[PDB]
């Protein structure tokens, strides 16, 4: 709120990488919808069997159990 700025470092804005495209995927059959190609290492709007989110999808070393479908962190 000033026309003159003193020497220093000022927190001005927020940077947020925006998603490139939407990834919607369903099982090898028909999950009541048309699946899309999987995109890795890119900020995308993913939707896996109705679970929606935005993020970067990378190949993981975590070993889900056969019945386990999703993974949750400490904050759930």
């Amino acid at each position: 709120k000033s026309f003159t700025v003193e020497k220093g470092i000022y927190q001005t804005s927020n940077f947020r990488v925006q998603p490139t495209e939407s990834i919607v995927r369903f099982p090898n059959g028909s999950g009541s919808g048309s699946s899309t190609n999987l995109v890795k290492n890119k900020c995308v709007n993913f939707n896996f069997n109705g679970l929606t989110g935005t993020g970067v999808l990378t190949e993981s070393n975590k070993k889900f159990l056969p019945f386990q479908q999703f993974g949750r962190d400490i904050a759930d």
Binding site: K62, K63, F64, F67, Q68, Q69, F70, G71, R72
Partner: protein, 198 residues
């Protein structure tokens, strides 16, 4: 007769992966160190059933669930090639709305929101009587949204153990591979309550 449940009757409450973490959950579980009936008569179902059986030649193979069990209402028949039917069969030893066709055996049967859920776990044992000491979570195997009202059930041919689930809070320990290795019953005793609190 009756026997001690020890730490049996633990199952994965969901299909969520976790790694090397303690998680508090509120669900229907078999209370630790509870009295489980030890043995066929028709038994009540209540809000859930934990079943266990020691087998040497696969004697116990069938289960019936229902309220009337006289063909008047839907009857859930499970026969281990696992065949699951909901036909109103008229009734036992050896209007269909569903039909699916596929040592200590532990099973958890419950019915929530019309979903009949069956968890199971099989393990070799060195004993022939009573539930042995140890811990092992039961994995889900069947989840059918049939909607059958169940208030009684029966087995179909050996001794077997029957217990009933209660709405309790449990602190489960997921190892690095997502396998539940330990569980704390928050209501068992003050020490377990402290563990849950912390």
């Amino acid at each position: 007769a009756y026997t001690n449940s020890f730490t049996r009757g633990v199952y994965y409450p969901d299909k969520v992966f976790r790694s090397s973490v303690l998680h508090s959950t509120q669900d229907l579980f078999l209370p630790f160190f509870s009295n489980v009936t030890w043995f066929n008569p028709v038994l009540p179902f209540n809000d859930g059933v934990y079943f266990a059986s020691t087998e040497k030649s696969n004697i116990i193979r069938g289960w019936i669930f229902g309220t009337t069990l006289d063909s008047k209402t839907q009857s859930l028949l499970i026969v281990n090639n696992v065949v699951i039917k909901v036909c109103e069969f008229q009734f036992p030893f050896l209007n269909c709305t569903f039909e699916y066709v596929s040592n200590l055996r532990e099973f958890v049967f419950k019915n929530i929101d019309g979903y009949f859920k069956i968890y199971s776990k099989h393990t070799p044992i060195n004993l022939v009587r009573d539930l042995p000491q140890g811990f092992s979570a039961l994995e889900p195997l069947v989840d059918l949204p049939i909607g059958i009202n169940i208030t009684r059930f029966q087995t179909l041919l050996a001794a077997y153990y029957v217990g009933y689930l209660q709405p309790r809070t449990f602190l489960l320990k997921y190892n690095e591979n997502g396998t539940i290795t330990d569980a704390v019953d928050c209501a068992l005793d003050p020490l377990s309550e402290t563990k849950c609190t912390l």
